[PDB]
From a paper:
pmcPhospholipase Cβ (PLCβ) enzymes cleave phosphatidylinositol 4,5-bisphosphate (PIP2) in the plasma membrane to produce inositol triphosphate (IP3) and diacylglycerol (DAG), (1, 2). Basal activity of PLCβs is maintained at very low levels in cells via two autoinhibitory elements, the X-Y linker, which occupies the active site, and the Hα2’ in the proximal c-terminal domain (CTD), whose mechanism of autoinhibition is not well understood. Finally, we show that nonlipidated Gαq and Gβγ regulate PLCβ function independently, the former through kcat and the latter through membrane recruitment.
We reconstituted lipidated Gβγ into vesicles comprised of 2DOPE:1POPC:1POPS (wt:wt:wt) as previously described, mixed PLCβ3, and wildtype Gαq bound to GDP-AlF4 and added the complex to the Gβγ-containing lipid vesicles for grid preparation. The CTD linker and distal CTD were disordered, as in the other structures of PLCβ3·G protein complexes on membranes. The structure is very similar to the structures of PLCβ3 in complex with each G protein on its own, with no additional conformational changes observed. The X-Y linker is present in the active site and the Hα2’ is in the Gαq-bound conformation. Each of the PLCβ3·G protein interfaces is unaltered by the presence of the additional G protein. For the complex with both G proteins, the orientation resembles that of the PLCβ3·Gβγ(2) complex, where the two Gβγs firmly anchor the PH domain and EF hands to the membrane and the other side of the catalytic core tilts away.
Numbering used by the authors:
A (entry chain Q): 13 to 92, 99 to 470, 575 to 873
B (entry chain C): 4 to 126, 133 to 340
C (entry chain B): 6 to 126, 133 to 340
D (entry chain A): 38 to 352
E (entry chain D): 8 to 51
F (entry chain G): 9 to 61
Write the structure that this text describes.
Amino acid sequence: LEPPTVVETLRRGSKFIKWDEETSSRNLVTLRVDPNGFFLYWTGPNMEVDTLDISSIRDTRTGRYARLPKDPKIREVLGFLEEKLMTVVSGPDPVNTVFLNFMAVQDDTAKVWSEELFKLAMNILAQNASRNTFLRKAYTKLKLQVNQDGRIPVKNILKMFSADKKRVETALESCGLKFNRSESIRPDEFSLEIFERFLNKLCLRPDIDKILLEIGAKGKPYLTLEQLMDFINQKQRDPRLNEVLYPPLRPSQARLLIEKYEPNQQFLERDQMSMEGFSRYLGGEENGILPLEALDLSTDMTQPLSAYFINSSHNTYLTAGQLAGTSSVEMYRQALLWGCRCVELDVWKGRPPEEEPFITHGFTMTTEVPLRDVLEAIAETAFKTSPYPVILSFENHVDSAKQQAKMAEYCRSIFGDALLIEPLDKYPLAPGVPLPSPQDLMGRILVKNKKRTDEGTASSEVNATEEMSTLVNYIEPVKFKSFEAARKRNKCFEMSSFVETKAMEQLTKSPMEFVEYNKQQLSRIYPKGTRVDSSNYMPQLFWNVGCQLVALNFQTLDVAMQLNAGVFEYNGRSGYLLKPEFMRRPDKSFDPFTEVIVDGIVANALRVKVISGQFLSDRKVGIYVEVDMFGLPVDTRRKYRTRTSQGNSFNPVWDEEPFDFPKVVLPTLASLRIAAFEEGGKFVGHRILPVSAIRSGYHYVCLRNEANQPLCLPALLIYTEASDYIPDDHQDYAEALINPIKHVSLMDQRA
Amino acid sequence: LDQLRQEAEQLKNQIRDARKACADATLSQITNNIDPVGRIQMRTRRTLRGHLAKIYAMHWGTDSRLLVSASQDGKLIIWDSYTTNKVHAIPLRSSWVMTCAYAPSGNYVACGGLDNICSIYNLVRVSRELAGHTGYLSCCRFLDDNQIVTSSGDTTCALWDIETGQQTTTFTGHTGDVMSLSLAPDTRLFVSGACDASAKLWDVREGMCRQTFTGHESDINAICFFPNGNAFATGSDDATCRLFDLRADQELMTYSHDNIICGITSVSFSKSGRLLLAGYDDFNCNVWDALKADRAGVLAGHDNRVSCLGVTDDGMAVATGSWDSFLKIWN
Amino acid sequence: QLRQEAEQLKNQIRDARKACADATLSQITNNIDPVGRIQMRTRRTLRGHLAKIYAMHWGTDSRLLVSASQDGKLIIWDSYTTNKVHAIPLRSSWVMTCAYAPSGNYVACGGLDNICSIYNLVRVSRELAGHTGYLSCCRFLDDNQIVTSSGDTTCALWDIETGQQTTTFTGHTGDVMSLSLAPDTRLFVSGACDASAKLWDVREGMCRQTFTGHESDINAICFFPNGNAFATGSDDATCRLFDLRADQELMTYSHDNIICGITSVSFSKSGRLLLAGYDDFNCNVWDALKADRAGVLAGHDNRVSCLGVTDDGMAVATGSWDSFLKIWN
Amino acid sequence: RELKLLLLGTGESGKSTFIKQMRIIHGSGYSDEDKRGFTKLVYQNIFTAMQAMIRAMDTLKIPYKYEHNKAHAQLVREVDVEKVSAFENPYVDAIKSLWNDPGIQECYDRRREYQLSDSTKYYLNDLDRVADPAYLPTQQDVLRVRVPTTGIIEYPFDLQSVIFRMVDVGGQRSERRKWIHCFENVTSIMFLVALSEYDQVLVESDNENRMEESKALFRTIITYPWFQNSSVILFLNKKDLLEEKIMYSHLVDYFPEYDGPQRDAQAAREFILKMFVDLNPDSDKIIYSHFTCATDTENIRFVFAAVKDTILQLN
Amino acid sequence: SIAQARKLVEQLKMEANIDRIKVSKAAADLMAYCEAHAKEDPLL
Amino acid sequence: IAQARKLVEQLKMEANIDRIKVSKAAADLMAYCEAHAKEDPLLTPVPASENPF
Ligand SMILES: Nc1nc2c(ncn2[C@@H]2O[C@H](COP(=O)(O)OP(=O)(O)O)[C@@H](O)[C@H]2O)c(=O)[nH]1
Ligand code: ALF
Ligand SMILES: [Ca+2]
Ligand SMILES: [Mg+2]
């Protein structure tokens, strides 16, 4: 994690011939990035600037990977080198992305611009930024987007806070600016101390005016050093942590918060923080809902491959329904650059005039993609965002002897070095020795294929030859027999892939044994062939028994894919999560369908109270907030949901009881989901937090859309109380352990 | 240092003996034969809406007609209690505004805030610019068109000059920040209440204190006078009021009620001297009897905090300007 | 040691400019009755361009002109009868300049193809190829010498009879946006992306002086028709008027209703004006001495990207990114 | 059978080090690839143990012998402790120039007035050999690292006739709400009292003596009716540190009821056992006590042999 | 620091020569002011 | 290296510049514009006889 710095060739910009294919309009623009790393802006064809949001860039490819022009009028006007092209592909979902074809004019300022802009699109301190940063993004979007005369149009400010255009047309008249629906503000006269004041006359806040009556700021305007330091040590302080690992704040330490957040100099001169210095602090860089050591690549990455929730996909190539959609190669690049580590490939037998294998769902008339471009998509983009091993779940339907050699030479020449041909010398393919780690395979691409009708076409694939099976070393599928005849075989490299409605008869019949299978071997689970509209099963139903390769259709982002793209955002967007300790120790055994707390697993007790919201909707509607928790089946039985919005627009305030999830049995598996809607069912935003890392006290949740990219303006304000669990038989005999001296001083006094 | 503490502190033991020597009667021993007021209800009239953020003070006029309503967004609006019309809507370069006033001649209006300046206006533009404090300003009142007494957060009450723009007298003697003051109806003296749980009686023609009062356990959040000028009452922060008597120099009564935890924000008497209103940070505006220590009615329409209060000169209206920008007027 | 020697010598110039700043021009121009306001009505408008016009250069006899657009057309207009006298389809669609010869028979046009083309008045005569960046201007001296200015911080003094550089005027740190010549054609000046006008010679070949004072690029430069001063125009909505003698700026043409950049400035026939064409689509006519505005030539629906006043000084002509050259008189 | 043993006791009492001892004695010991994972923790331990002296210095209001050696304080004062991976050239000559300072050596004797780990007289005396680039940590460098335990970790050890499940728990005041999830099916409670903590105050509470908290915590553990059918083995850790210490710090200053001899480590070691085995409400129950030392492996061997020999014959 | 102690000593010197009127002669007059204004009470 | 010597050898050529005062240069600009204002067809308006447009 680093702050997103902007290189000095990026700021002050370069000169790009920005072309297109639809309109086929070629233009010479100059590209700048603003000095915080927020927007990529360039002047238009009619002298108004445009702003690509950098935080919504999927990829920035260049060189021989970039989008070549097709129109012979535009191949001639660009000068056709091919090492200058730069394609900045952005978009909100992987299914409907929007390209942006540039072309450099100097010698190789495109390999620089396409790398120092991809490091700002994949920055874990920009996507997880504070709330006072997402209000300097909605301010840079107003300073940048000027009209022809070099001045912010007032028809743009009303088009930002577009719920009440009478509270926006009156806040502008109180700060002194022009407030006509056609007029224009000069950008020197819209400084950040004016936009901060303009947001204060807009949004009346009685949520943050109580947070100050509760901590004892009853009278005078200053909140002292002592009250603030008792606030950050007692309310905002996670009560599951050591008091020696993370020590509480000392007065030497809660005084660089005053010198960072205080605007006044007669208050900061002593040690007294004003109220505006407090409301600057609640959305500060410190007071975030998740700590910075929960998002960087910090898990133990050396345990065997059988002990990791690997991310997955099922029929990755389709962009639509499973029956008559359109299959494209781009859903290999957009899946893997999201944190996917198990793609599917349905390699089918090619035609007589050119024997070349292609990819389609079998016998359903979907369009076809060839294998040589699919493998060049997988090889290009695999280790761009996470250096951890990609598994290619082949489905060999090719019954031609002359084409298995073609698909072997394709795998051996396109991947080349990064294909795990030969087994590692440390972990041989012997009965008993386990699978490697993600660190013994950092940068290896492992094929998955056989060696020597709820499923659809997956149930009948051909027997492999000696030319394709020789790349299958560790991950190898084999026909399932039972569990007892797979635990006396004791081979920790073989696997067997389940369909969903036949793993639902092994998840319920024997879930004691189906964890202990997955402590040693792998398992892949793909949705059944009745879901012909590209819908998903819930993966946390199948992650309770520790199944790793849970395959999900990356097309339709329903609730299952808002989960599978929100819990694999942790571990540094690496696509590898670590199983909890009781599902990867071969001695400890436990039931996933349990109803009590497990002996050795510390429980927790969550209490989320949703207080208010900021700028949630773009129209005057009512807004409700759903709060769910996913986990073991004894944690998911609570799905709370607030009443609809009762406060004014730009700031709904809910008066709801705190939602108590009192007994989380395994809190290193459970994950909380806060999804704010509109009345009628429209999505607005959601955030998926884990329970084992979410802090306590009055925090800002900065909401995200359905693919977990940050929404700029919307946010909630919740109050969480994540403490430990103490059972009902002795909740006072865990008070005799915290303060034992006074407990015995009471016991001898009561004699 | 401690060689003079033997004399300076035995006077603090003498000053309790002198005040306990005269306290032979209380209000419950004289006003037991005083008939009660019953219940006093009031109905909301003419909610002067129009502010964009929190109202922080108000002050009436002498002819019971106009009232300044300072806001937290830089807007001194001079409302009319009859017609609900913004007679002026004077903007400010200052955002944080914590005080306002209105001259007895009606042609001047003051201001203040965290920016240390008491900007007296003219009646539209800034007439004089009053700098000279070193902390945040809290309450400013007018003696006349040529003198203003301000009370800052740098432990200073200050009697100024309007035309030139310099302090003609500075009163120190407090320890903590001075939260409010209130002039006397004779205007030969005034009083002031501060963050060190003290309230001192000054003198405007001399320049120094002459009586100091204690009894509260936290800040004095605001303060006001009995209408004749021979007793004065305060708010507090531990949800209690008082009534000190300047002819006896000792506290007389305390307006504490059970199930009242949220503290005072402003206190203002009536024109008959009989109802002590009080603001509260539990969103209400409760009314006490001044002579029997018992409540007499709730004035509850607001939902955010109540920041200020005041009857007019004739005692007709009660303008309770809350924190939710709606300045209700009761009768 | 050399940085101390550079920053010590860079302070001898500031006190020297302070000693020669004895009585500024704004003070001594207080005894002149101003021009007031000049009103120019659009007399001709030339259509025939299909895309954004990037440059122009008025002829020497003040009658014809030549313009260049991104659709690969260099058209020569007659500014009396509005007739396309010639139209040259180019070998590259990207131009950034054009020029017209003082003899009146050659036309130069270089662009992003890094190569200055020279046409005869048809077919291209020479092809001046040695540059490592995009060409950003060119102005003829006569039928043999042409002072280009690329975007690799250089200039040139090409000899078109053999196509090789007589001199090369290295010395900037960024792109030489646009030059200008002199009335005697013995000196010239140049701009930059370094906020730094420079001045050179055409025989000695050395950067003779250096002027600074801006805050962003220099996008265009003119010359005083006496030959003793010039004036730039920047990307930060500020024209100046530097001098050759005092080596310091003399005025500054900027007032704060105007924020967007400048694209071409040009003086009048007597030099008592300064026509500057902004990016708010208008071409304000500053008074060259009092530095107050004296008109607005608001006629264009897109960004104005060229100007130029005739050799006689009769009528000015501008041309914008909506393909129309309008001749304001 | 499989038997479950709890390791209960307060913080910085050396419970993990007892787990490392059982990993050396009765398990897979530290091989060559296993010690090299500790070479960052010794450097971070030296940095934290040196910064704690620097802050206490400014808090103990004293001056450094040399201002040239005072200039070496800020170079170690600004190190990000968690981001330390190498022990390079300018950092050796800071902490190797601050330790021969007579002022800091005078500060070191007043370590009862602040927080400093009890393994800084073994790391800042091998420091001429830790600064070598060809560093492999010895096993006693491994048994003295300071890695503060959070949560609750389990540990099984095959003793060739039974299998003991040591439960390594946390030790602070914020780690005693997690012990509740290991009280089911206990067999014995190995309490770990640090003998040489009678004159230091707690980390989270700077007023209460650390020997009273263990004396208090131990009163509570054996008075549960939950641990009524489970044997209690008391271990008196750090028995050496209370042999080099008793010579300058007396037990009559911190526990006034001490009626034994002065400057005798064995008398205070005998008195702690009287102060603990007389914390029994029932006269019938007995507490099996051993005076251990969690870094001396030959001390832990016979002690744990006796503990296995009494736990299996109690069951 | 001695000047502040000297001013704090000299401030309470003028708090001693002040004649005080009894509370029986003060609360009675405060009640006589409030019984004599039952005709100018707009809030009752 | 070569930049460090060519910059100081160019700035050493910025010494011997014989400059004429701003009050004289401004007077010469005013002597130029107010002597050639007769010829300019943009300061004074032109008659429509000689105007070709
Ligand atoms: N000298 C000495 N040090 C010890 C002994 N036992 C433990 N320590 C040290 O005390 C320090 C703290 O022990 P620690 O592992 O942190 O216990 P925990 O925090 O409760 O898990 C360790 O570095 C041990 O080396 C002992 O018998 N003698
Ligand atoms: F104090 Al510990 F493990 F008990 F760090
Ligand atoms: Ca398939
Ligand atoms: Mg431990």
